[PDB]
Amino acid sequence: MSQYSENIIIGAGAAGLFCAAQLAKLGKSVTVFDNGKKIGRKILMSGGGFCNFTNLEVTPAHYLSQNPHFVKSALARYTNWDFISLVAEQGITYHEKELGQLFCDEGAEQIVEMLKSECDKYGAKILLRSEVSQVERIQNDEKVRFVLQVNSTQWQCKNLIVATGGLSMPGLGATPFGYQIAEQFGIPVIPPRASLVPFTYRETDKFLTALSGISLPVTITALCGKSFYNQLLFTHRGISGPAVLQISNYWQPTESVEIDLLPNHNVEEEINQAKQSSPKQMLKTILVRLLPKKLVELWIEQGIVQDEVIANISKVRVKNLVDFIHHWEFTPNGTEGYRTAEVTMGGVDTKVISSKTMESNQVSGLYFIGEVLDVTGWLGGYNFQWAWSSAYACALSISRQ
Numbered sequence: 015m016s017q018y019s020e021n022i023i024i025g026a027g028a029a030g031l032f033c034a035a036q037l038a039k040l041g042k043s044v045t046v047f048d049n050g051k052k053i054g055r056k057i058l059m060s061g062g063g064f065c066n067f068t069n070l071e072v073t074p075a076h077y078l079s080q081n082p083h084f085v086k087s088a089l090a091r092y093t094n095w096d097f098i099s100l101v102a103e104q105g106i107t108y109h110e111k112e113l114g115q116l117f118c119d120e121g122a123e124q125i126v127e128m129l130k131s132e133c134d135k136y137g138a139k140i141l142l143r144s145e146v147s148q149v150e151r152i153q154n155d156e157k158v159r160f161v162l163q164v165n166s167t168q169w170q171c172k173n174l175i176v177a178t179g180g181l182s183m184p185g186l187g188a189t190p191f192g193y194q195i196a197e198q199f200g201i202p203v204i205p206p207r208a209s210l211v212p213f214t215y216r217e218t219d220k221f222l223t224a225l226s227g228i229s230l231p232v233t234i235t236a237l238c239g240k241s242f243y244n245q246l247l248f249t250h251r252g253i254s255g256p257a258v259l260q261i262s263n264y265w266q267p268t269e270s271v272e273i274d275l276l277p278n279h280n281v282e283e284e285i286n287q288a289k290q291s292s293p294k295q296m297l298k299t300i301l302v303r304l305l306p307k308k309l310v311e312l313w314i315e316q317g318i319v320q321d322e323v324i325a326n327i328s329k330v331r332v333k334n335l336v337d338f339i340h341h342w343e344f345t346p347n348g349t350e351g352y353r354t355a356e357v358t359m360g361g362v363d364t365k366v367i368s369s370k371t372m373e374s375n376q377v378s379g380l381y382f383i384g385e386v387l388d389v390t391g392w393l394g395g396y397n398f399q400w401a402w403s404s405a406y407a408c409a410l411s412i413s414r415q
């Protein structure tokens with residue numbers, strides 16, 4: 015057996031499925047291989063089961079990359095609105111959760127269903143339980159530029175689109191195959207790291223484990239200056255939540271994070287209003303009215319915060335408390351693994367890839383789309399949008415040959 019398909023796609027995920035659909039729709043033959051048992055396994059998990067498919071405010075600045083000028087082209091070619099429009103026209107209902115985030119009303123199944131439907135509608139063939147391996151480059155054959163082993167059959171193609179994703183969720187089928195193919199052809203890869211992931215506590219902060227389950231709004235600021243205002247969640251392992259997941263993109267191993275527990279109010283102003291309006295009251299009572307009761311109690315049960323009458327508090331101790339709550343210098347021991355991480359930072363170096371095409375500069379006929387590229391977006395549907403955009407730029411480019 016020796017099959018052929020002008021276009022082969024490795025990975026039946028967000029980027030793979032969408033690209034396969036665009037190609038069939040533009041009238042090109044394409045086959046998709048996937049080591050998994052079902053298509054779009056991560057799409058089904060995204061957005062807590064409803065799929066945060068994009069965000070109303072998308073710009074290149076919502077993406078992390080060694081190469082800042084990369085993302086702009088594909089994002090402007092196929093926009094968040096081009097997809098929002100495809101979704102609505104496709105009969106899918108969605109709503110805005112917060113911060114421009116858009117989710118499906120009827121679950122992530124809608125997105126996966128729409129993708130699989132477009133592919134069936136235009137001719138794309140999807141083969142599951144097919145793990146790709148042994149990719150070889152062919153040089154003389156004008157019709158065959160690549161050969162590869164899928165199970166026991168050898169496939170041949172003119173264009174090979176790599177949409178294998180990143181490393182998070184290994185139990186879901188995640189593979190480094192995309193990087194392995196790149197490295198085999200001498201294509202540079204930026205060292206991958208788990209991102210949009212929780213932080214783990216060092217020994218000195220382990221006592222905060224007692225706060226597990228508690229949640230509050232804070233502002234997290236990374237050493238590079240980036241800030242995010244959102245919810246922070248105390249865990250058994252460390253700290254998590256939207257604010258933490260967001261800042262893990264800008265945080266670097268060995269680095270510290272600046273956490274403001276009371277971003278909202280101006281503690282001193284308040285502590286003073288209570289110093290006049292309640293000279294009798296305890297510090298603990300004024301504090302619990304601002305922060306979670308159990309956190310305030312823990313600082314006390316740890317002797318970190320003295321509980322005295324508002325009146326018996328020197329203006330200097332009031333200013334040390336204020337700085338203490340607004341400037342918590344947190345140094346995580348590290349990050350949780352790829353089993354919790356939402357994405358993977360790093361990947362194929364985007365400077366050797368085409369900004370307009372997604373095609374490899376070093377190896378013609380080889381394309382990289384999706385998360386495998388060194389393009390990581392913010393939490394909030396940005397990662398899926400990059401998948402739609404890069405998959406489209408690739409398909410549109412190939413249809414033009």
Ligand SMILES: Cc1cc2nc3c(=O)[nH]c(=O)nc-3n(C[C@H](O)[C@H](O)[C@H](O)COP(=O)(O)OP(=O)(O)OC[C@H]3O[C@@H](n4cnc5c(N)ncnc54)[C@H](O)[C@@H]3O)c2cc1C
Binds near residue numbers: 356
């Ligand atoms: C728990 C969780 C929740 C998430 N929620 C959101 C969200 O709400 N919004 C958002 O924008 N993003 C979200 N993401 C991230 C998002 O899923 C990805 O950024 C996006 O799916 C990347 O698309 P992709 O096609 O590159 O890869 P994937 O969607 O991962 O698909 C690639 C496929 O390639 C296949 N593959 C790998 N190696 C091989 C091989 N050797 N042979 C054949 N096939 C192979 C895999 O089976 C995989 O299914 C979430 C991620 C996780 C883990």
